[PDB]
């Protein structure tokens, strides 16, 4: 028995116009994180992690996230395959993940060399989850980019306690 804020209709999620797959590659730090399964937790606050996007020759992305947990670096790898329009993707090899029936990625906005906001929605064990990441080329972003991320998250039904700014760290992600 779970309770979740509903996924917003896709019409409320903008798409980055003219998406350039080659320029979005590289490392992105997660300076902000929001979603219906994201919960602030002041006692053990979320540490910053990073996600690296590499264009494979077939134009799919090989995606690697790295987090510092239990004194070690944990790597998670997935494949994002170009979806219905430039800037949208679905998950490769969905079959290999137990209980996952849909996964959508939409790049909301980016200038490529400093910041990005990406929307994700998936259905896992029949529950509909969504999150928005505020990506930075550096671990810090202006208070202006942060507020904007907050406004957008709220615009999708999320309250403040479902929006966090992971704390910068040096382990694993540099
Ligand atoms: C292990 C534990 C905590 C943790 O560290 N999880 C991180 C792992 C690294 C990437 C950030 N992230 O996004 Fe997870 O991805 C989501 C995608 C769409 C909507 C919601 C989520 C989501 N993930 C968090 C989550 O808690 N997932 C579950 C289920 C875990 C298995 C399914 N999930 O949930 C995955 C699967 C694989 C790694 C994805 C790699 C790429 C990129 C995205 C990014 O930049 O955040 O990501 C979980 O048990 O997580 C909360 O919402 C996490 O889950």
Curated annotation (Swiss-Prot):
It comes from the Eukaryota. Disulfide bonds join 73-172. Detected in neutrophils (at protein level). Expressed in bone marrow and in tissues that are prone to exposure to microorganism. High expression is found in bone marrow as well as in uterus, prostate, salivary gland, stomach, appendix, colon, trachea and lung. Expressed in the medullary tubules of the kidney. Not found in the small intestine or peripheral blood leukocytes. Induction: Expression is activated by the oncoprotein BCR-ABL; BCR-ABL misregulates expression via the JAK/STAT pathway and binding of STAT5A to the promoter. Induced by insulin. GO terms for biological process: acute-phase response; cellular response to amyloid-beta; cellular response to hydrogen peroxide; cellular response to hypoxia; cellular response to increased oxygen levels; cellular response to interleukin-1; cellular response to interleukin-6; cellular response to lipopolysaccharide. Glycans are attached at residue 62. One of its GO terms (molecular function) is identical protein binding. A carboxymycobactin binds at residues 49-51, 122, 131, 135. One of its GO terms (cellular component) is extracellular region. Keywords: Apoptosis, Cytoplasmic vesicle, Disulfide bond, Glycoprotein, Immunity, Innate immunity, Ion transport, Iron, Iron transport, Pyrrolidone carboxylic acid, Secreted, Signal, Transport. It is found in: Secreted; Cytoplasmic granule lumen; Cytoplasmic vesicle lumen. Belongs to the calycin superfamily. Lipocalin family. Iron-trafficking protein involved in multiple processes such as apoptosis, innate immunity and renal development. Binds iron through association with 2,3-dihydroxybenzoic acid (2,3-DHBA), a siderophore that shares structural similarities with bacterial enterobactin, and delivers or removes iron from the cell, depending on the context. Iron-bound form (holo-24p3) is internalized following binding to the SLC22A17 (24p3R) receptor, leading to release of iron and subsequent increase of intracellular iron concentration. Monomer. Homodimer; disulfide-linked. Heterodimer; disulfide-linked with MMP9. This is Neutrophil gelatinase-associated lipocalin. The lineage of its organism: Eukaryota, Metazoa, Chordata, Craniata, Vertebrata.
